[PDB]
Structures are given as C-alpha cells and as structure tokens.
Amino acid sequence: TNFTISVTTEILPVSMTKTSVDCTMYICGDSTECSNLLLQYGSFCTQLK
Amino acid sequence: TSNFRVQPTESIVRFPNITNLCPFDEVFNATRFASVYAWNRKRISNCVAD
Ligand SMILES: *[C@@H]1O[C@H](CO)[C@@H](O[C@@H]2O[C@H](CO)[C@@H](O)[C@H](O)[C@H]2NC(C)=O)[C@H](O)[C@H]1NC(C)=O
Ligand SMILES: *[C@@H]1O[C@H](CO)[C@@H](O)[C@H](O)[C@H]1NC(C)=O
Numbered sequence: 508t509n510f511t512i513s514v515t516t517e518i519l520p521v522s523m524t525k526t527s528v529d530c531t532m533y534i535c536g537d538s539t540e541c542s543n544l545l546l547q548y549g550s551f552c553t554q555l556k
Numbered sequence: 557t558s559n560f561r562v563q564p565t566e567s568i569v570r571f572p573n574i575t576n577l578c579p580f581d582e583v584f585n586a587t588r589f590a591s592v593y594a595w596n597r598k599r600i601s602n603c604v605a606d
C-alpha cells in the first residue's frame with residue numbers, strides 16, 4: 508500500500524597508479540660491472556618493462 | 557628506450573685522519589712470542605694501515 512524511495516551506494520575500483528621500473532638502476536645502481544653482467548643474462552627486465 | 561643519467565666529474569675523498577703511526581715492529585718482529593695455548597691478545601687501535 509506504500510512505497511519508499513531508498514538510495515543505495517556501490518563502489519567499484521577502476522585502475523591504479525601506473526608504475527614503471529628499470530633493472531639496471533633499481534637492482535644495482537650506477538655500477539658498470541653490474542650492467543656488463545646483466546647484459547649477458549638476457550632481456551628479463553626488458554620483458555618486465 | 558632507456559633512462560637519462562648524468563656522469564661524475566671528479567672524485568672526492570674524506571677519511572678520518574688518525575696519522576699517529578702504528579708500531580707494527582713490536583708486534584711483528586718481537587723478541588718474545590706467546591704460545592698456542594696462551595696467545596697474547598692486543599687491541600690495536602688509532603693508528604695507520606701501512
Ligand atoms: C506512505 O509513507 C510516507 C512516509 O514514508 C507517508 O508520508 C508521511 O505522511 C504523514 C502524514 O501525511 C507526514 O506527517 C509525514 O511527515 C510523511 N512522511 C514523510 C517522510 O514525509 C505517507 O503518508 C504514506 N502514505 C499513506 C497513504 O499512508
Ligand atoms: C687531518 O689532519 C692533518 C693534520 O692534522 C691535515 O693535514 C689533514 O688535512 C687532515 N685530514 C682531513 C681534514 O681530512
């Protein structure tokens with residue numbers, strides 16, 4: 508016999524902050540020997556990028 | 557492609573200047589040496605690594 512106009516709220520995530528990292532700097536830093544050793548290991552961090 | 561990085565120009569060195577000389581002669585070429593079962597322990601500090 509009666510009606511109620513109720514209001515409900517729904518929250519859904521959309522996305523996050525985009526993060527980009529580099530192997531040769533974050534893993535070791537500015538060492539040239541680290542870069543030389545990482546060059547022979549392949550392209551793992553290239554695939555990660 | 558890659559990352560932009562800068563290069564160092566000159567090297568800067570700063571070390572604690574304990575230049576009081578280290579008498580290694582009294583511990584290396586000493587007249588008397590201790591034994592294996594009772595070895596003498598000396599805490600050498602505040603000298604140079606020559
Ligand atoms: C249906 O319900 C609403 C409330 O949900 C009724 O509205 C109330 O009516 C009385 C008297 O007319 C007022 O004193 C109230 O302030 C009203 N409520 C609100 C929230 O405004 C309505 O009368 C009901 N319908 C019937 C036919 O009884
Ligand atoms: C340490 O002291 C000596 C003399 O006391 C000085 O010549 C030398 O520059 C000092 N080292 C420093 C400030 O790094």
Ligand SMILES: *[C@@H]1O[C@H](CO)[C@@H](O)[C@H](O)[C@H]1NC(C)=O
Pocket residue numbers: 581585
């Ligand atoms: C003993 O050690 C001192 C350290 O200066 C060295 O000059 C000397 O030649 C050594 N040998 C002898 C026999 O003194």
